[PDB]
């Protein structure tokens, strides 16, 4: 189970937290009003985080502390809603029987028990807040039969714990108060219990080669990264512009665009503009067929199974049928594969032929195109 490992890691955390030789010291404060022992101040825990974790941002370490303290590993002594606030307020760890890692699950009758007990320990005030008084009202209205032994065991517990010493009753009641804060929290702060229903159950090359490839593929667009270093400062997000994308709309490229075409004809064909200009050169050079074929293959790989046969036979009769004008050119195993598969229209029909013609084009056309006068004149401006 996933979150179990999460709680285990944070258990590692607090275990290092209350370390014997190191750790925060749980002090006993003395006040003009009283003498409170076994607490400490949130600035202490903040300092402890920063020391032993090297969390550079005070804010970052504070957020880590925030969610830890909202998982019941320490609480503010005078508040319901778990939040670590860096100041002089008094905290406390929790008990190994009341972590949240122990698969615990309270239920409505037990909430009624804790309500009766708190409301009946003191009888000086409605020692509670409005949400908890509201919860008890509902529990009354719906638990009409079963109340009595609730009250019974409540005051029984009260005697069984008050019989032990006065500081003992205080610390135990504080702990077994906060642990029900965390498992039924105030309306505002998020619960930290729930989980998502999903979890509710060979040729190789040297790394240096990959290093060069990765660095270089970074660099060749490194000057295109619109997060790191963008030459077009036009940011429709940041600087309230629209012109950048709108220039991206127009068929006229950017000089960026034309320099970017020059890397690989694959990227060119990705570009519609690149498709158009490459096709123009192929036409004016009387060499506009293989690109026509490959575009044909790709435009065939887009339609559903309703048209696959309607196109495959037709495309054969137009290009791959010997005697048609468009003369795609195959070797032995290529044309063999084509003839065998052409009976059956397939989603991967012309793989080897496409490989053949594709390596042809990648090896020949793109080079001369980048070397071409039209390319140079368009990249100049």
């Amino acid at each position: 189970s996933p979150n179990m490992l999460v709680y285990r890691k944070m258990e590692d955390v607090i275990a290092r937290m209350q370390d014997e030789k190191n750790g925060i010291p749980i002090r006993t404060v003395k006040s003009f009003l009283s003498k409170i022992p076994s607490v400490f101040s949130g600035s202490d825990i903040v300092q402890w985080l920063i020391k032993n974790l090297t969390i550079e941002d005070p804010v970052e370490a504070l957020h880590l502390g925030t969610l830890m303290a909202a998982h019941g590993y320490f609480f503010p002594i005078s508040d319901h809603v778990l939040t670590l606030k860096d100041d002089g307020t008094f905290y406390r760890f929790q008990t190994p029987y009341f972590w949240p890692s122990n698969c615990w699950e309270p239920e409505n009758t037990d909430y009624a028990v804790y309500l009766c007990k708190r409301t009946m320990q003191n009888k000086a005030r409605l020692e509670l807040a409005d949400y908890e008084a509201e919860s008890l009202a509902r529990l009354q209205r719906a638990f009409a039969r079963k109340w009595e032994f609730i009250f019974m065991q409540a005051e029984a517990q009260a005697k069984v714990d008050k019989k032990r010493d006065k500081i003992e009753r205080k610390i135990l009641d504080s702990q077994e108060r906060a642990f029900w804060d965390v498992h039924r929290p105030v309306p505002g702060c998020v619960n930290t219990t729930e989980v998502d229903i999903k979890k509710s159950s060979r040729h190789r090359l040297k790394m240096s080669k990959v290093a060069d490839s990765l660095l270089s593929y970074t660099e060749q667009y490194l000057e295109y990264d619109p997060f790191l270093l963008p030459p077009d400062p036009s940011n429709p997000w940041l600087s309230d512009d629209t012109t950048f994308w709108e220039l991206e709309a127009s068929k006229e490229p950017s000089q960026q665009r034309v320099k970017r075409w020059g890397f690989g004809m694959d990227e060119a064909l990705k570009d519609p503009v690149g498709r158009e200009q490459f096709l123009k050169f192929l036409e004016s050079e009387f060499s506009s067929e293989n690109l026509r074929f490959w575009l044909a293959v790709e435009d065939l790989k887009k339609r559903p199974i309703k048209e696959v046969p309607s196109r495959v036979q037709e495309i054969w009769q137009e290009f791959l049928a010997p005697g048609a004008p468009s003369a795609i050119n195959l070797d032995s195993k290529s044309y063999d594969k084509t003839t065998q598969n052409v009976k059956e229209p397939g989603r991967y029909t012309f793989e080897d032929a496409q490989e053949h013609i594709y390596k042809l084009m990648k090896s020949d056309s793109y080079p001369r195109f980048i070397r071409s006068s039209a390319y140079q004149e368009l990249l100049q401006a």
Binding site: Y97, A156, V160
Partner: peptide
């Protein structure tokens, strides 16, 4: 009532001791 009460008391006591 007395039997149930005594049982509940001793049981909660044994529980709180097992927790300690």
């Amino acid at each position: 009532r007395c039997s149930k009460k005594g049982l509940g008391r001793s049981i909660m006591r044994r529980i709180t001791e097992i927790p300690e």
